[PDB]
Design a protein around this ligand. Structure first.
Ligand SMILES: Cc1cc2nc3c(=O)[nH]c(=O)nc-3n(C[C@H](O)[C@H](O)[C@H](O)COP(=O)(O)OP(=O)(O)OC[C@H]3O[C@@H](n4cnc5c(N)ncnc54)[C@H](O)[C@@H]3O)c2cc1C
Length: 502
């Protein structure tokens, strides 16, 4: 096979998987249809210039490193490989369109504003250069543009309305893995590979993680292979799956009470469409089962809902200019923001959650509720954008639409408006962890406190605090605010802001 004329490119960004990947599958099918004509290059473009951006924490870089290694491993089973191309797309694509004689480029669509801008520019260049582009909406179960169209041009702004719309939509088909490449030699080295054969090899941990001191325990390895193993593990207890009720899962069990598939769904290591289809099979054969919103399918529909409102608002992650967002006069509080950011608020439940987040990169949904309420309307009266920023740095599952949507909910800025309901930083965790095992783990300086005061260590006398080895103001901070006072003030501030907006 000396005969090749062109290269077929799949561009990974999200969609970091072989299964249920129509953009990738179509490349491999086209290659096999015309033996001898094509080379195939599945690529991921890594801009070294952002390895130092503090908004990507080490834990999330490590998850990507592991994911790319797995993706490359899996593509090798198809007689292909991953090509990790270092550079910026604005410079990479002109070069490789010419160098590789690219005939077709496929990718999975992404709704985030810079991605839309970037992809429109790649698409314009491709059209000019005669490159056929095919894009697929496989990151979400439904295409937000069809949802918005079915709703007469507006995104549904309640969960029940959204369910009412998507009930009327066809469910896109879930694909298997692509065909193994037949009769295809490896691509000839381009000018970059000619100088360094390894130029497109998967990055090492050292190449990707510039701040290894931020790494915590490796609890959730990256990659499709782990994503599928973890999904199958969650699905094997079919009664647990069928009867799942999200509000009844604990925020502070030591091991996660929910699936922790969110890092996998965020990177596309797991297809949400596959997972939806598997859940539907379970629900159909388990006559006793939960329903949306609280069921596991309901959780995937939460993700769908936020992707659809976000698709219609480029400013979804900001207060100003955001069609959904109440304008609320959040205050600047640098010292309180720093304390919340580092889990030094003096409320042990809140601090344990922020410390788990920083160390491990995942915290349960209702743990996110507790700390987000505390930062914003509940206690510190700081903008939800500041909380979004910190979550963006530390979460493995950092997701532009899901982070912004849930921060607006928790701050009573959109989608949720019952701001008289406020989480108690002392009482909320006790329902599910009365001994405080979660605090003893993540705030180890309090680990000797009796369970009767570990949520509220200021209730222990100085002599008791000394006996427990941890004196407030010396070994663990005093409360930075007093919840019982400030949350009442903030309920009045929320009332005022709601009036101004009305
Ligand atoms: C302030 C705040 C910020 C959040 N930021 C993110 C984020 O950046 N990325 C993210 O993936 N989720 C985010 N969430 C939503 C949710 O808390 C996580 O999706 C969930 O904790 C992931 O754990 P799990 O995989 O065990 O979820 P499960 O309960 O097992 O749910 C399965 C999947 O459904 C989806 N899902 C579940 N709950 C929600 C929800 N409330 N909204 C949207 N999708 C949901 C996720 O893809 C999740 O993996 C945020 C929530 C809050 C309150």
């Amino acid at each position: 096979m000396d005969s090749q004329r062109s290269t077929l490119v799949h561009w990974f960004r999200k969609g970091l998987r072989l299964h249920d990947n129509p953009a990738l599958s179509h490349i491999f099918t086209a290659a096999n249809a015309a033996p001898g004509r094509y080379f195939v290059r599945p690529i991921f473009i890594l801009d070294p210039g952002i390895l130092d951006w503090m908004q990507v924490g080490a834990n999330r870089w490590r998850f990507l490193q592991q994911t790319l290694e797995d993706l490359d491993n899996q593509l090798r089973k198809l007689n292909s490989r991953l090509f990790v191309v270092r550079g910026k797309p604005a410079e990479v694509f002109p070069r490789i369109f010419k160098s590789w004689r690219v005939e077709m480029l496929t990718f999975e669509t992404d709704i985030e504003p810079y991605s839309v801008t970037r992809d429109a520019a790649v698409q314009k260049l491709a059209k000019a250069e005669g490159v056929r582009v095919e894009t697929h909406c496989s990151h979400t179960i439904y295409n937000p543009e069809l949802v918005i169209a079915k709703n007469l041009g507006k995104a549904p702004i309640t969960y029940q309305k959204f369910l009412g719309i998507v009930e009327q939509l066809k469910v896109p088909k879930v694909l298997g893995v692509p065909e193994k490449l037949k009769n295809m030699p490896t691509p000839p080295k381009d000018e970059v590979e000619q100088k360094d054969s390894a130029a497109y090899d998967c990055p090492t941990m050292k190449q990707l993680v510039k701040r290894p001191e931020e790494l915590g325990p490796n609890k959730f390895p990256g990659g499709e292979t782990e994503a599928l193993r973890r999904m199958e593990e969650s699905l094997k207890d079919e009664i647990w799956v069928a009867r799942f009720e999200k509000p009844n899962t604990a925020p502070n069990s030591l091991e996660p009470s929910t699936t922790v598939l969110s890092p996998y769904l965020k990177f596309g290591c797991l297809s949400a469409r596959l997972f939806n289809q598997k859940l539907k099979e379970i629900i159909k054969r388990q006559p006793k089962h939960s329903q949306p919103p609280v069921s596991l399918i309901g959780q995937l529909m939460w993700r769908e809902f936020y992707y659809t409102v976000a698709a219609a608002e480029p400013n979804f992650d900001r207060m100003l200019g955001n069609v959904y967002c109440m304008q609320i006069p959040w205050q600047e509080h640098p010292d309180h923001l720093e304390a919340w950011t580092h889990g030094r608020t003096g409320y042990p439940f809140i601090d344990a959650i922020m410390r788990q987040l920083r160390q491990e990169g995942w915290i349960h949904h209702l743990a996110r509720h507790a700390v987000a309420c505390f930062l914003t309307r509940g206690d510190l009266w700081i903008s939800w954008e500041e909380g979004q920023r910190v979550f963006e740095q530390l979460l493995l599952d950092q997701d532009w639409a899901l982070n912004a949507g849930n921060w607006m909910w928790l701050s009573a800025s959109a989608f949720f408006h019952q701001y008289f309901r406020v989480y108690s930083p002392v009482a909320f965790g006790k329902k599910t962890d009365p001994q405080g095992h979660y605090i003893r783990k993540y705030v180890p300086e309090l680990s000797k406190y009796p369970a009767g005061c570990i949520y509220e260590p200021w209730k222990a006398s100085l002599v008791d605090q000394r006996a427990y080895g941890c004196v407030l103001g010396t070994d663990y901070p005093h409360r930075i605010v007093k919840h019982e006072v400030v949350h009442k003030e903030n309920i009045k501030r929320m009332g005022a802001a709601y009036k101004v907006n009305r």
